[PDB]
Amino acid sequence: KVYERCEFARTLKRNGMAGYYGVSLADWVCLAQHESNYNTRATNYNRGDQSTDYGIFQINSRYWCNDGKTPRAVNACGINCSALLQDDITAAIQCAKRVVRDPQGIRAWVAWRAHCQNRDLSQYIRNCGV
């Protein structure tokens, strides 16, 4: 239930996402990194703003995913946030796409805008043998 730059990259490329129309594998990695790669323990709830940041891709439960304990959220993904806390990231990818599919775009992770769009993050993926 753990994923690292390499792994993630491999999987991504193994899934067929790494190098998406726009989202570049490197961007994914860097992103997934800025999110909370490693172990699928990326969980940070916050009632203060009826929002929760869960998922390796640090997905907010204030719009994406849901639970059923908060009859307010607008689960745009329409899935159990827990589904993003499993072993297979299939949900993370599916949701990831189901999310980016919106007019939001990777931009949502402005972080990447201040992490990826800064230096060469290719050196991070360049080594796995991609």
Domains of the chain: 1-130 (1.10.530.10)
> What single-letter amino acid sits at 56?
I
| 112 and 30 Cβ atoms separated by less than 8 Å | yes
Helices (H), 1-129: 5-15, 25-35, 90-100, 110-113, 122-125
The answer to whether 4 is a known catalytic residue is no
Of the candidates 21, 22, 67, the residue with the CA atom closest to the CA atom of residue 47: 67
Q: What is the DSSP letter of 80?
A: B
Q: Which of 7, 53, 102, 120 is catalytic?
A: 53
Distance CA 11, CA 40 (A): 15
Distance CA 28, CA 23 (A): 7
Q: Which of 35, 88, 102, 120 is catalytic?
A: 35
Distance CA 29, CA 6 (A): 8
Of the candidates 106, 110, 117, the residue with the CA atom closest to the CA atom of residue 28: 106
Of the candidates 106, 77, 108, the residue with the CA atom closest to the CA atom of residue 90: 77
Distance CA 126, CA 6 (A): 9
